Design a protein around this motif. Sequence first.
Motif, PDB file in Angstrom:
ATOM      1  N   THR A 178      -4.440 -16.555  23.763  1.00 55.72           N
ATOM      2  CA  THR A 178      -3.821 -16.677  22.446  1.00 55.72           C
ATOM      3  C   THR A 178      -2.819 -15.555  22.336  1.00 55.72           C
ATOM      4  O   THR A 178      -2.851 -14.622  23.131  1.00 55.72           O
ATOM      5  N   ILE A 228       1.610 -25.188  20.622  1.00 57.75           N
ATOM      6  CA  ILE A 228       1.029 -24.630  21.848  1.00 57.75           C
ATOM      7  C   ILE A 228       2.155 -24.463  22.842  1.00 57.75           C
ATOM      8  O   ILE A 228       3.057 -25.301  22.900  1.00 57.75           O
ATOM      9  N   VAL A 268       6.459 -26.364  25.431  1.00 59.07           N
ATOM     10  CA  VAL A 268       5.945 -26.088  24.100  1.00 59.07           C
ATOM     11  C   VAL A 268       5.929 -27.407  23.359  1.00 59.07           C
ATOM     12  O   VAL A 268       6.720 -28.293  23.658  1.00 59.07           O
ATOM     13  N   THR A 303       2.756 -19.852  18.049  1.00 55.30           N
ATOM     14  CA  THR A 303       1.510 -20.176  18.686  1.00 55.30           C
ATOM     15  C   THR A 303       0.412 -19.519  17.852  1.00 55.30           C
ATOM     16  O   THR A 303      -0.531 -20.190  17.437  1.00 55.30           O
ATOM     17  N   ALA A 329      -2.275 -20.591  23.720  1.00 61.83           N
ATOM     18  CA  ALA A 329      -2.591 -21.330  22.518  1.00 61.83           C
ATOM     19  C   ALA A 329      -3.637 -20.560  21.735  1.00 61.83           C
ATOM     20  O   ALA A 329      -4.461 -19.869  22.318  1.00 61.83           O
TER      21      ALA A 329
END
Lengths: 155, 155, 155
Positions: free
Chosen positions: B133, B146, B9, B140, B100
Amino acid sequence: MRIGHGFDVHAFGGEGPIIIGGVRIPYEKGLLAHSDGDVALHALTDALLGAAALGDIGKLFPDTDPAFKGADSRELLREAWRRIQAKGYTLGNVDVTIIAQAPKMLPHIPQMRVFIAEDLGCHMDDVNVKATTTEKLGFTGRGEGIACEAVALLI
Amino acid sequence: MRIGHGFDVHAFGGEGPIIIGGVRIPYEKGLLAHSDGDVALHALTDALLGAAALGDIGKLFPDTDPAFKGADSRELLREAWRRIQAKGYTLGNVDVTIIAQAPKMLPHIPQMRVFIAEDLGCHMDDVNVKATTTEKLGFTGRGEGIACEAVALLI
Amino acid sequence: MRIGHGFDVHAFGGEGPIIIGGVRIPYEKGLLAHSDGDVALHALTDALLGAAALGDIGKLFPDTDPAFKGADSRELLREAWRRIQAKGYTLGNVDVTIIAQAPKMLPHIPQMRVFIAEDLGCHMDDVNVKATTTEKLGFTGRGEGIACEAVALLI
Ligand SMILES: C[C@@](CO)(OP(=O)(O)O)[C@H](O)COP(=O)(O)OP(=O)(O)OC[C@H]1O[C@@H](n2ccc(N)nc2=O)[C@H](O)[C@@H]1O
Ligand SMILES: C[C@@](CO)(OP(=O)(O)O)[C@H](O)COP(=O)(O)OP(=O)(O)OC[C@H]1O[C@@H](n2ccc(N)nc2=O)[C@H](O)[C@@H]1O
Ligand SMILES: C[C@@](CO)(OP(=O)(O)O)[C@H](O)COP(=O)(O)OP(=O)(O)OC[C@H]1O[C@@H](n2ccc(N)nc2=O)[C@H](O)[C@@H]1O
């Protein structure tokens, strides 16, 4: 060969130390759980049970059942491992990823590998643990709790 | 054959563009990191090292060591890959999942597969990347950063 | 044999019930999505497509394309599975982990295994689903939505 995936989370709470992959790690806050709340191991366990197609740690060792209170997760692991071997499987290898901002898992990892490889009855070379933070992002990043994922391969 | 799991991350920060799976992707904000902070690749790397039972990118290429500053993660990857091959393993295949909200990873994915397959020295058919996503949910989803997971199979 | 990893999330919204791994599960709130938003299955699908090296559910069945509206995810699954078999692969086994605080996935799991094993055309013994909460932590823990991971092995 079969694959398996696991995942657990536990909220910090009370005084430390915490238990991860079997190692008593000193930390300000501790972890809240019916058992010893060893996330690293619960994660490993599910992944192991998942490969065995035996479901999860929850179908086998209930939060409700009082005997599992303060329960040494390694026991749960060894048992879930027993039942797995009975189903005729054998450890391919396991990989555990600790997603925690703190405490520093790193120095304890080898001892963890020792504990896990013992419980599973394999060589350390079949047990790998690693750690990572979420960069101050998330409940993990905020220090609200620890999460842990794990994958495993059975034969 | 051995399995392996990785996860990274990185918090958004500063001006873009960002680097993921090797591709310079344009975006408003950039990513904060000691190296180039290519999450897709760090994730792949750990998963690869995990299968090799060599630990993680952290035991091998420190945040502290200044040489790893602005470091091209593909280098780190290629090296971790080298050491892995030395341990006598060979790429089964890898799968990377980018979690993301933005930017749109999709159009860059093939180029990523090109970069990754090169670094690993396999065919694109052994390197798969995908994106998703978290539906505006989470750091996020909030655009705070991300995350990226990856799994790998070695032989 | 090839590995594969998947992951999906969906925000709660509107009236229930929800659909997970094919089972209509009653719950106060429902889930928002272009398709039926069955997270368990989307997760499984990507992991399956990932192993096949066919990318993800997104490259194959667009949010934009209206036909995929209210779409029975099992269809998407069966198709992604078809194309996978065409590429000459066969199911090793799949493992799905539902990370949700509620509703209680547990009682529905067997029916899920029935649906998934049908769609894939394997035995339940090749399809394993399990569930877990994030201990009130996170969007999942806050009840903001459900997440789900899945791994798969193809041959
Ligand atoms: C081993 C024990 C008890 O000693 O450890 P602790 O949780 O106390 O540490 C627990 O059984 C370990 O519980 P764990 O499965 O890892 O996390 P939990 O959030 O407690 O999940 C409990 C059970 O409920 C089911 N479940 C979970 C989440 C959800 N949304 N729906 C569900 O139906 C799962 O099948 C799981 O087995
Ligand atoms: C390659 C580098 C440096 O150039 O990249 P960047 O982070 O700068 O992008 C880093 O070493 C890549 O660090 P990464 O492992 O992916 O995430 P980090 O949060 O920095 O973890 C650093 C190290 O600390 C250990 N660690 C991590 C989290 C935690 N709670 N306890 C730990 O002991 C892990 O063993 C890990 O190797
Ligand atoms: C099957 C469908 C349509 O019926 O289901 P629903 O989302 O409506 O439930 C969707 O295509 C299922 O979408 P899913 O891939 O699981 O999650 P999304 O957030 O919608 O991702 C859509 C696509 O955009 C790409 N993507 C995603 C996130 C990101 N940061 N960059 C990207 O480029 C991915 O390649 C993905 O295929």
